Design an enzyme around this catalytic site. Structure first.
Site, PDB file in Angstrom:
ATOM      1  N   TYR A   1       0.841  -1.183   0.000  1.00 38.79           N
ATOM      2  CA  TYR A   1       0.000   0.000   0.000  1.00 38.79           C
ATOM      3  C   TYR A   1       0.887   1.248   0.000  1.00 38.79           C
ATOM      4  CZ  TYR A   1      -4.108   2.865   1.334  1.00 38.79           C
ATOM      5  OH  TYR A   1      -5.166   3.755   1.365  1.00 38.79           O
TER       6      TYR A   1
ATOM      7  N   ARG B   1      -6.591   2.727   3.589  1.00 34.61           N
ATOM      8  CA  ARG B   1      -7.344   1.467   3.515  1.00 34.61           C
ATOM      9  C   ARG B   1      -6.653   0.246   4.112  1.00 34.61           C
ATOM     10  NH1 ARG B   1     -12.122   0.352   1.694  1.00 34.61           N
ATOM     11  NH2 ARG B   1     -12.737   2.109   3.011  1.00 34.61           N
TER      12      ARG B   1
ATOM     13  N   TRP C   1     -11.905  11.898  -1.688  1.00 24.55           N
ATOM     14  CA  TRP C   1     -10.470  11.899  -1.429  1.00 24.55           C
ATOM     15  C   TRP C   1      -9.613  12.183  -2.647  1.00 24.55           C
ATOM     16  CZ3 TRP C   1     -10.078  11.848   3.692  1.00 24.55           C
ATOM     17  CH2 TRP C   1     -11.071  11.183   4.439  1.00 24.55           C
TER      18      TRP C   1
END
Ligand SMILES: N[C@@H](CCC(=O)N[C@@H](CS)C(=O)NCC(=O)O)C(=O)O
Ligand SMILES: N[C@@H](CCC(=O)N[C@@H](CS)C(=O)NCC(=O)O)C(=O)O
Lengths: 199, 199
Positions: A8, A14, A104
């Site tokens: 990530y 997330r 976002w």
């Protein structure tokens, strides 16, 4: 037991729910963080072109909540009974539904900042009251034991407080809840060692 | 065995995945449909003020995917192994992520119709190619047995075709898959008896 590789961005985002679960279960994994600059090279190699993904024994899993649910199976975190497991899932879904409303990726930094404002001042109080009502006087969302729903509330409220610092002022119960999650030793340790990041 | 009461609008919408699972497992339930006009009276009585909800022995569950996952536990529909269960979950989440982009509640019928257009012509092809690539030549998404992920694809593609009739023309494999799901007897019977509705 098995080797894990989380992939990530260098942010909570997330993947943070997965990082909490690993921390709690004391499962070692490689927390592979990438910079936005590297993403273009990596994106085309992933199944559905998105992150986070979990490499398990050379198998790439995707979808944060699908992975979180997979890691919590046959664990108390998922909820003890089938009814409680559904309730745990429902709470995570209610919280995620809300966080998803936030634009976002919004390029227009005017509209974005203006939408964030609406969300934070018009919708949040409704989510917070239902959540507060749901929690009632239980120790944790589900009852007398911690589940990954409580972890998710800590994760979601953290970002929200970065947005609107006084958001939880009227909800002491929701405050106590996140404080409790943060006091769990495995989580406290993670919070202290985790990279300081905005989102 | 137990008595079930499903509550939702008279439409496929979010409750349809639950209705498919009941049909397939041959579980009886009351399919309580309400008109938009009734919603205002009902909304304030529900936990998080939203539907669908499932009344089980006088306990109200919420969140469609949380309920679908609960109904499919200890059933082959959820996936046989823990790894496959995670993959079934991930596919449902990928499809739901997309369908969520659609501004179904958009008041501005100009912008809405214009966003739908964008989604349907710019993003869908990417989702469809990854989905197609994922399915490959397997009989079903997971492999040689039907799961609720396949049901979800039939449910999602139905609404999408209402939007753009020629959307699946380039994807025969995805077409064969939804046709197979529709040929399952329990589903065929449901499809025929289910109220004709747009969404
Ligand atoms: N529901 C999915 C969402 C995945 C997603 O949208 N990931 C974003 C990061 S938050 C991403 O991959 N962005 C890169 C891109 O799409 O180009 C999950 O939770 O994994
Ligand atoms: N992710 C939730 C979404 C729930 C939702 O948005 N439900 C809509 C109907 S599709 C609703 O309750 N509408 C009535 C309202 O919000 O006033 C689920 O799948 O249950």
């Amino acid at each position: 037991m098995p080797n894990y590789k989380l992939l990530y961005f260098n942010m909570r985002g997330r993947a943070e729910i997965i990082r909490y679960i690993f921390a709690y279960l004391d499962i070692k994994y490689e927390d592979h963080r990438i910079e936005q600059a590297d993403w273009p090279k990596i994106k085309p190699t992933l199944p559905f072109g998105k992150i986070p993904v979990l490499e398990v024994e050379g198998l790439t899993l995707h979808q944060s909540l699908a992975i979180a649910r997979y890691l919590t199976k046959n664990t108390d975190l998922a909820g003890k009974t089938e009814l409680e497991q559904c309730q745990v899932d429902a709470v995570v879904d209610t919280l995620d539904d809300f966080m998803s409303l936030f634009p976002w990726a919004e390029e227009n930094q005017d509209l974005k900042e203006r939408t964030f404002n609406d969300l934070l001042t018009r919708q949040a109080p409704h989510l917070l009251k239902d959540l507060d009502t749901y929690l009632g006087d239980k120790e944790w969302f589900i009852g007398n034991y911690v589940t990954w729903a409580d972890f998710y509330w800590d994760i979601c409220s953290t970002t929200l407080l970065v947005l609107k610092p006084d958001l939880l002022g009227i909800y002491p119960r929701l405050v106590s809840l996140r404080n409790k999650v943060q006091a769990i030793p495995a989580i406290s340790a993670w919070i202290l060692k985790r990279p300081q990041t905005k989102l």
